[PDB]
Structure 1
Amino acid sequence: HVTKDMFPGPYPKTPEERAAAAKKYNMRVEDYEPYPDDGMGYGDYPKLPDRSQQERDPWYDWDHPDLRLNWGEPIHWDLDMYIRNRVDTSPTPVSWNTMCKHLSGFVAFMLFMFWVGEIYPSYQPVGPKQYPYNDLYLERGGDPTKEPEPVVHYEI
C-alpha cells in the first residue's frame, strides 16, 4: 500500500531527486522546498508556509473539516502546534509590533504609577487610631508577666 519508496528520505542534493521528492509529497517541483540541510534531521520533508490551520479557508469542503485538511496533501511539519486549539498566526487588525508596544506601555505605565502612588499615598487628616490598655497589650498576646511600657492617650 505504502512502499519504502513513498517514505520521507534524506535531503535532496541534485535536482532530479528534488523533483522526485516533490512528486512523493504530491507537490509541484517549483513549489517543493525542503528545510535547509543543517544537521537537524529534516531530510526531504517539504518546508510549507508556517501558517496556522485557522488561516485556512473555512468555506471550503475539506476532507477533514475540523482540521481543515485534505486527504493526501502534504502535512506541515508543525501541524500539531498550528491546530485551531493551539498557536494562531492569523493576521490581526493592528500589527504585531504596535500591539506589543501598546500592551507593554500600558503595563509599564500602570506599574510605575502604582509605585508612585505607593511613595505618594492617599490618606485622611487624622492622628493614629487609639486603643486602651496599652494598645491592647494582653489582647494581642503580650506576655502577662512582663509589664508593658504604658501607652497613654489623652482627652485632647
Structure 2
Amino acid sequence: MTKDMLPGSYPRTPEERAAAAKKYNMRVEDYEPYPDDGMGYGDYPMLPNRSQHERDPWYQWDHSELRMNWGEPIHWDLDMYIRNRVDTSPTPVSWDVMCKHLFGFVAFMVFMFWVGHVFPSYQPVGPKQYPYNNLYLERGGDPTKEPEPVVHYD
C-alpha cells in the first residue's frame, strides 16, 4: 500500500474532501468527517451509529457474521457494534418507558420489602424454650466459671 490510499488529516477543502471520499469509496455527498475537536480523527468518515444487527440478515454479504462488504467503510466503533457485543436495534417499546417501568418496579419492590420489615408476619406464639440455661455449656461455656441459672416455667 501507499500514502494516498491510507488515511490522513482533516481535509478542510472541497477537493480534499472529494479525494478522501474517493479513497474511502464513498459518495461525496455522504462523506462526513469528524468535527475536528482535536483527536485522532483525521479524514476518517463519520458513519451512523447503527449496529450490525440492523443490516439485512438475508443478503449474502462478503463478510458474513460481520454484515459488511469488501469495501464499505468500517465504522470507527467496529469492535463494539458487532453482533456479538452491542445491539442498537429498535424495540417495540421505547427506551424511556422501558427504563421508567423497570426502575419503578425495582423501587416499588424495595419499598415493599421495607414495609414488610416494619410490618413482619409472626405466628402468634412465643419463643422456644431451651432447657439448660439456653445450653450455656454446649455453646462454649467455660465450665470453671459459674453459669447464669436462667430457668423457664410450665
Report deviation, 1:112.
Answer: 1.2
Report the counterpart of residue 18 of structure 1 in structure 2: 17
Partners of 2:141 and 2:122 lie apart in 1 by 30
Q: Which consecutive segments of 4 or more residues in structure 1 shift more than 6 A?
A: none
C-alpha offsets along residues 119-150 of structure 1, whole Å, 9 cap, x if unaligned? Answer: 11111111111001100000111221222221
Bigger proportion of residues as helix: 1
List aligned pairs for 1:1-156, cutoff 5 A. 2-155=1-154
TM-score when normalising by structure 1: 0.96
Partners of 1:117 and 1:148 lie apart in 2 by 38
Partners of 1:24 and 1:81 lie apart in 2 by 25
Partners of 1:90 and 1:71 lie apart in 2 by 23
Two-structure CA RMSD over aligned residues (Å): 0.9
- Matched to 2:75, the amino acid is H
Partners of 1:114 and 1:15 lie apart in 2 by 64
Partners of 1:102 and 1:59 lie apart in 2 by 34
TM-score when normalising by structure 2: 0.97
- The gaps in structure 1 that reach 5 residues or longer are none
| Secondary structure of 2:80's aligned partner | helix
| Secondary structure of 1:5's aligned partner | coil
Count of equivalent residues = 154
- Matched to 2:89, the amino acid is S
Partners of 1:15 and 1:147 lie apart in 2 by 98
Report deviation, 1:21.
Answer: 0.9
Identity between Structure 1 and Structure 2 (%) = 87
Report deviation, 1:54.
Answer: 0.8
Report deviation, 1:59.
Answer: 0.8
